[PDB]
Amino acid sequence: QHVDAESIMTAPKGKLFHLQFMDGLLRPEPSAFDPPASGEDMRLIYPLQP
């Protein structure tokens, strides 16, 4: 997906966009040796309620 903030910010007062979180818990722990990578990956929109 990737709700582009263009719009999450300014789109009709109705529109029901389907943003989508990740569920990292079954994520693989990078091989104890291999060299690092270098872009932190973030998210700029968090749900405001549980």
Binding site: F33, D34, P35
Partner: protein
């Protein structure tokens, strides 16, 4: 008279380093350092990937 000695430029030793890479990492990207120093460091680093 006694021709016993043969001229050479870059001599080899009766010993050397032999490494074995754990091809799992390494990248094969043959690390690229500077140019001036690529030559001095040059091989040691390529060998010690």
């Amino acid at each position: 008279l006694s021709d016993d000695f043969k001229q050479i430029s870059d001599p080899k030793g009766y010993l050397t380093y032999s490494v074995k890479y754990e091809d799992q990492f390494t990248k094969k990207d043959k690390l690229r350092a500077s140019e001036a120093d690529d030559r001095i460091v040059g091989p040691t680093v390529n060998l010690f990937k």
